[PDB]
Write a protein that binds this ligand. Structure first.
Ligand SMILES: O=C(O)c1ccc2c(c1)OCO2
Length: 167
């Protein structure tokens, strides 16, 4: 049994809810929250900007030190950093950004990072300002992630379309 409430069960391991990822993290304090990161861990907008704002910029300060030591992530890659006030850990995952011309086949590689964590609160990778089709992102998630994933969707309209169209 876990703390996650109000989710729609899609499969054995994937759950979905219309919720503010920030507000959901603050309520649950999950072991892992996933950030929709870029390779530079520059948390300007979208999910990343919202998560970072909720940490009062501590996520960005920590991320800048990580990049200064390790250099950029790979598209499809990830790193584990602090979850600050939101979670124990933040898994920063880089999905391909279609608005930069990145290979959408890297979306599966991105979701494979979730399999290193038994339970996660996450957004749909490469959705929103990353430019991919969220219906496609949900399909790759279900067909890739084997661990227990609780997906938070920012828009009620998109949430309802994802559920109605789910095979
Ligand atoms: O919370 C936000 O401001 C935000 C902004 C962009 C998003 C999102 C959340 O879900 C995925 O796309």
């Amino acid at each position: 049994v876990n703390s996650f409430s109000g989710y729609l069960k899609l499969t054995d391991n994937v759950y979905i809810k219309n919720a503010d990822i920030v507000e959901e993290a603050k309520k649950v304090k999950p072991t892992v929250v996933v950030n929709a990161a870029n390779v530079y861990l520059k948390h300007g907008g979208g999910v990343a900007g919202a998560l970072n704002k909720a940490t009062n910029n501590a996520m960005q300060v920590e991320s800048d030190d990580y990049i200064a030591t390790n250099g950029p992530l790979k598209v499809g890659g990830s790193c584990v950093l602090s979850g600050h006030n939101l979670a124990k850990h933040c898994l920063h995952v880089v999905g391909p950004n279609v608005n930069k011309g990145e290979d959408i086949q890297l979306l599966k590689s991105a979701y494979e990072n979730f399999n290193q964590h038994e339970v996660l609160l996450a957004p749909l990778l490469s959705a929103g300002i990353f430019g991919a089709d969220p219906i496609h992102s949900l399909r790759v998630c279900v067909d890739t992630v084997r661990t227990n994933v609780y997906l938070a969707v920012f828009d009620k309209n998109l949430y309802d379309k994802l559920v109605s169209s789910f095979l």
